[PDB]
Every structure is written in structure tokens, then in C-alpha cells.
Amino acid sequence: TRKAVIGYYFIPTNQINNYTETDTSVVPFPVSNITPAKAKQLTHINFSFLDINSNLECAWDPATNDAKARDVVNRLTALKAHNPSLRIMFSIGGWYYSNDLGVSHANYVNAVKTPASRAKFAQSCVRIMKDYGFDGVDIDWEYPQAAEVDGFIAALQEIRTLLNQQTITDGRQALPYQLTIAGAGGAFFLSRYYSKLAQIVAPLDYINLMTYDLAGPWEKVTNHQAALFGDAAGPTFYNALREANLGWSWEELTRAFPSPFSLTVDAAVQQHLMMEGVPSAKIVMGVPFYGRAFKGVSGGNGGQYSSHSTPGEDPYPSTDYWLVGCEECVRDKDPRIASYRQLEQMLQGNYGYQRLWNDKTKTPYLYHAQNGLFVTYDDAESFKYKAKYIKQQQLGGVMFWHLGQDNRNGDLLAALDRYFNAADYDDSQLDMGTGLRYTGVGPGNLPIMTAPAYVPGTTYAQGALVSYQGYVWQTKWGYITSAPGSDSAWLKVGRVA
Template identity: 20%
Template sequence: MLKSLVFSLMAVQAAMGSRFAMYIDQYHTVDLPGSDQTQEITHAIMAFAPSKQFNTDSSFTPFETVEAMRKRFGPDTKVMIAIGGWGDTAGFSDGAKDEASRTRYAKNVATMINNLGFDGVDIDWEYPGGNGEDYRKVPNSQKTGEIEAYPLFLEAIRDAIGKDKILSVAVPGKRGDMIAFTKEQGPKIWSSVDMVNVMSYDLMNRRDNVTNHHTSVAGSLDTIKAYKDIGLDTAKMNLGFAYYAKWFTTDPNSDCAEHPIGCAVVTLENPDGSDTGKSGALTFEKGNMASPPDNLKTSTDGTCGYAKGTKCPSGSCCSQYGNCGTGDDFCQAGCLSDYGECKGISVTDSWRRALKDGKTDEQAGGQYYWDSTANLFWTWDTPEIIDRKFKDIVTAEKVGGVMAWSLGEDTLNWEHLKGMQKGLGQ
């Protein structure tokens, strides 16, 4: 008996920190790795199904079949579907509002995952209770009912899909966005789910007015502790990692040269909550990181960039989204100077300076760079920071697993994926 207890304890300890959930989004499917590079990934989460889809009996078709997705991973990897995502809250709000709507929504989710062969579902509601992308148009005061409805919504989905299917949730990293995650509601939420994907990144966003790390050891640890405080067992948590850097335009009159962390930024969000175009993200893809191909052709269909192998015609700019044009949306911040002209700053050139001269905030455990030429502040994870997160958070706090967004955003050399695989092997 004692021997079996010892082996059971060893098994639990071995499993601690071994869960690896990976999002695969529909917009980054070029150059995805083969199964020989993804063996450590235990949960592959395809993103996204629209939240409104399940308020009716309409069918859903994912961007790739479950069978095709399974071939990208090891034989034991669970393939799941994520519902929602940033800016997609209306369907959840409607689905959660009363018992009848919750029952209908849950039944449709269960039907979908069973018919398509998914192993589970991830509810990515950003965010119940408010502070989502629509917070200026639909104020938080109109969403207070979601605080109590959210755990009931998850309970209905759990009942509908059964215990053989996996139910996970993606939850905010910033304390100010944890409106529905209270000490009273927390235990009701956690009891329905198998794992919690903690988005411990985007800790600086366009609603902030001074620079800070969008992801760091200190920031991620604070997020983990916030959820511990409302009753979430760390064994259910997946610590989140971002496969992208973020940049923010700083105020030319600020003191960023002396104090790059905590210096003023320009207005990053319009009064209606929309983006001013003065901040953004840059993924660790070949298209953003690698030198352009030698045989670039001139675009004939209005698209541009590394993946297309095309540049814009003379006088035209290539936007950060890979489209040619001449307006500010194409030629200002985010413009890809390797594939067209740019007016003003080039985010690509600034990022290259950041990579070359980036600095480590040893105390906070974050990588950053302030570009005085472009007045841009950069913040991102390096393999060294990833290693620290495993040691100082995953191991120290006995976190049950890790998660990353998203696989197709690390295609240059997979150094962030490899960094996480190394951390899991320690």
C-alpha cells in the first residue's frame, strides 16, 4: 500500500506543469510545423467559432477538419475548438441571459463537438461583465447580469457535453478585467471546467497611458496570484505565453529616454473605443522577422508580404495586414517597409533595432526597447524570460500547465515554442 501511494505521488508530481495547450488560429496556418516538432503539445485548440453560432441550430464548419488538425500533433493530443475571441461577445451575452437560452446554447455546442469529432471546447468570452472590445458602445453597467450568469452558462455547457469531453475557459490577465471573477463567483466557475487558460499577456494595451511590459515574470505572477485569491487551484491553471511583441507610440515630450518603463504614450484609443493606429502587435513569423525573398514580384491583386512573395506597385504602401494602398491605414504605423513604401515610421525597421538592442528588466522579468528614432516602445518575451517564468511561476507555484497564442505566429525559428518545450522538460 505504501509503495503504491509513493508511486501515485510521483505520478502527480510528474504531471505537474506537463499540460501544454496551444491555440492554432485560422489566420496563421502557413508554415505550421509537423508532428515531429509538436509532440509535447497536449491540447490543440482551433480558433475560433463565432459566439453567435450556437444561439440557433445552424451548423459550423471549422477552417480545417479535425482529422487534418490531428495529423499535425502526436497521437495523444486532444483537439478542441475555441468559441469567441477578442471582440466577439454578443453571442455569449445572448446565450447566457436565461435558463432557456443557456440550455439551447449548451445543446448546440455539444452537438457541434460530437458531430465534428472535437475532444472538447474552450469558451473564450472576453469578457463576462464588461471591459471587452465593445465597452464604449455597451457600457459595463449593462452587463452586470453576466457576472452571475457566467458560471451558470458554463455549468449548462458542462452538463450538455458530459464529463468525457474537455471544457476550458480563457480568462483575462489584467486584474481590472476580472469583473466576473470574484471570490463569490470564482468557485462556481472553476467547478465546471477542466482547465483555465490564463491570458497572462496583453498586460499593457491601448487603454493605458504609460508604458509597461505587456508580459513579464512579475506581471504573470501577479495574475496567477489574483486567481489563487478567488479560489482557483493552480493545478487547473495554464500559464499563458504570447508569440508576439507589442509596440506603442510614445509621447515625443515624455521622459522615455530616462524612464522607458512608465513614460507617457500618445492617445491609443478613440473615444468610441476603436484603435487610433498608434499601437499594435508584431508576430514572430517569417513574414515579419525574416528578410524578404530575393525574387519579390509586383503585386497584381492588392496583396503583399512575405507569404505572398509580392511587393506593392511604386507609390503604394504595404499595410501590417498585407494589403496595398495609399491611405494612412496602409502607409503609417504598422507599414511593412520591405514590401512597399511607408510614410513616417517603419515598424519593421524599428523592430529590427529592438531585436538588436533590446534590454532586459531584470527586476520585473521582461524584455523591452524604446526606439528614440521612431518614438516606439516595444515589449516581448525571449527564451530567457520564458525560462524564468517556468522556474519562478510554473514550478514555484505548482501551476498545472502552460498555454500559448498561437502556434502559427512563431514560424521564424520556433524559438518560443522550443523555449516552452525546454521548460516542460526541466
């Protein structure tokens, strides 16, 4: 099965309103930069972003020139002429609209509350999808929590119902409408809905994990934002999942959630796989086409794991664009984020950057020894490891933010497509390294085990293993006269074949 390659196409309202394909000062990345070759390398383009308005309906930013919006979407859908598998999805939400402190957050929370609000919202998603010619719905609510999850799940199920009927109504069996969401790629936000992952993913074609932004100026120690595996020399984090409302015992929580742990892509993927009912085929690994930068870093380890003096505030609080040679940073008024395209130019221009590689995390980084700068990002090399991981772990594919950040040659996207589909690319011998793997085991993903059937009336000693009602259980203390599962003395440690 072909691996998904889901690229975001993000275009701000002002750019849609002033859309032009011949003025990069107005529209840096027009749809025309998505060439037929690039179109063929993609399976999905997530057009972003639509939002949920106060009427609790999926809607374009009210300030959008609708005609221009249609034209931009048309340009993307026309790309399907180059690739019959391509879907132009549209994404609702995103960090700015939907984070807790985002302007539209209330609308996401309220839209999913009742059968009526969910029906109204779901219908609007499909209406928007059909009206503009999109091929599916992607929701990027970052992130529902608490009592919002059940409503969110129901809204997803509703949209799913509507999309499946729409596929029939339109005779779209050859390219059915799809439903996806951007999911957290780090334990902190993931903990908000982790316990219900199975229900959330059930109605989805894919859950695209934001397995990046795992480091940034909001953290006191510089680090790789998307390490595939962990570097023991790097910072570790509190495993927030152990605090999720799972109802598991101390032993189960401990087995599943080692803490502190290495905040890596592997950790997020394995954390999803520890949950029963979450198919690897639906998990899409997100990768960033941009780097995050810090200033004030110390030397010695190329800027890695150092204190720094980078403001973490959003928006960037100053006018000091200190990322040497980053012109797009000036444009976006923030020296803390830079497209791979821009980083590559910085590397090519005598700006003082040194490209280094961490072979544990399998990710690159730039170190500016002169001005004490550190940039964590991904490139075609880190993508080899991530692509092999995607194939080895049987994940659904890769997602990335965003198309305009690839270099002009579209090397990152070409690299992803190559690693998955090129007959002449062979990563069979690519060494995945000795970086730290996430080793948690969830009661939902226990290994197959074999043990003598439990015998009622038997008094078991501590450490005894028995098979019973589909699982192999182990006693946690002795003089056990209870049947496994009937009390607290037994721990499910394996599945019976």
C-alpha cells in the same frame, strides 16, 4: 503531472475560405507549419474562433465555407497522430466577438439566461465539437459580468455534464473531452466575476489566464505587457478587485487587495489563488507570442514608463505603419502589435532596435532610440522565469496566443516544452529576482495559525488572537465580549489545522 501547453491556432474566416498551404500571402500560417515536433510540444491547440450566433447556439461565422472549415480542422486533428495526448479544442468567442462592444456580445449574454437557452447552447457546443472532431470546448467570453455570471456558470456546468456523458458515449476515457475558458489576467476585467471564481472554475479542466495585454497603447504610460513580477519604477494600478461584490470587510478587502499595485502575471495568479476553491492545478498562465508597440517614447530608461503618442483606437486609425521593419504590421495594418517572429526579424535586420531586459519584471523589450519606439514582448528568456513560476506555484501549465507568431523554428513553443519536460534542462538555480510579488491574502486562503480557543464570557483586548470554529480570529478593538464571527470586532486571520 504534465504541464498543459495550450497554443491557439487562429485562422480568420477569409483564410479558411481560401485555405492554402503554399501561399503565405493568403494563409500566413497553414496547419502544415505545425510540424510533428511542434505537435508533440503541445498538449492542446485551441482552434479559434467559433461564435455564438443570434439563435444562441455555438456556430461558425455564417460566411465560413463549411467544407474548407472541416478540412482545416481535419489537418489539426490529424496532428494527434504525432501526440496521443494532444487535444484540438475549439474556442468560442474571443475579444472581438465577445467584448462588451463586440458584434456578438448580446448572444453570449442571452445564451446563458435560462435553463432552456443554456441547454440549447450547451447542446450546440457538444454538437459542434462532435460534428467537426474537436476534443473539447473552450469559451473565451471577455468577459461576463454582473447578473451574467450565474448564467455563465450554469452554462459551463451544463456543457460539463454533456461532455462527461459524451466521453462515455464515445469511449473516450483515454482522452476525455475537456472544457476550458480564457479568463482575465488583469484585475479590471477580473473584478467582473472574481467573487464567483470558484463556481466558474469548478466545471473546468483549466482556466487559461490572459496574463498579458497588461500594457498597451490604450494606457498613457508605456509598460511591460506581461511582467512576471513588479518593477517599483513602473506604473501601478488601481486594484479593481477591492470593488468586486465580495461582501468582505474593509480590513479583509485591504489585506487582499493592496492598491495601487503592480499589474503583473504574478498578481493575477496570486489573485486567483486567494479565492477559496480555485485549485492552482487548473490555473494556466497565458503568455503572448507577440509584442505591443508604442511610438513617441522618451529615452533614459529604454522607452519604459514613458508618455507616448500611440493611438489606442481599434482598429488602427491611420495608414502610418511606423514600426520600422515590421512587414507583418503592414499586412495587418497596425504597427502596434508584432509577432515574436516579426520582432526577431526586426532585431536581426539593422532596423535600429536594441533588445533590453528588465530584471525585475523578467521580460525583454525593444527600444528604438532613433525613432522613439518601445516594444514589450516575451521570449524564451522571460519564459524560463514564467515556466519556473508555473512549476513552483503548481499551476496547470501555459497557454499562448498564437502559434503563427512563433518564429519559423518554433523556438518559443520549444522553449516552453523544454522548461517543463526536458530532462536536460535544470532551472533549480534560476534566480527569480527581486521584482515585487503580489502579497494580498484572501479570507479564503489564510495561513495555518495556532491560538488559544476562544473562551465565552471573556473580554478580549485589541489584537487578541483566538481559535474558533475553524479559524484563528483577531480582535480589531478592545473590550470584546462577542464570540468571533458574531459581530464586526473579529477578523479571520488564519485557519485552524
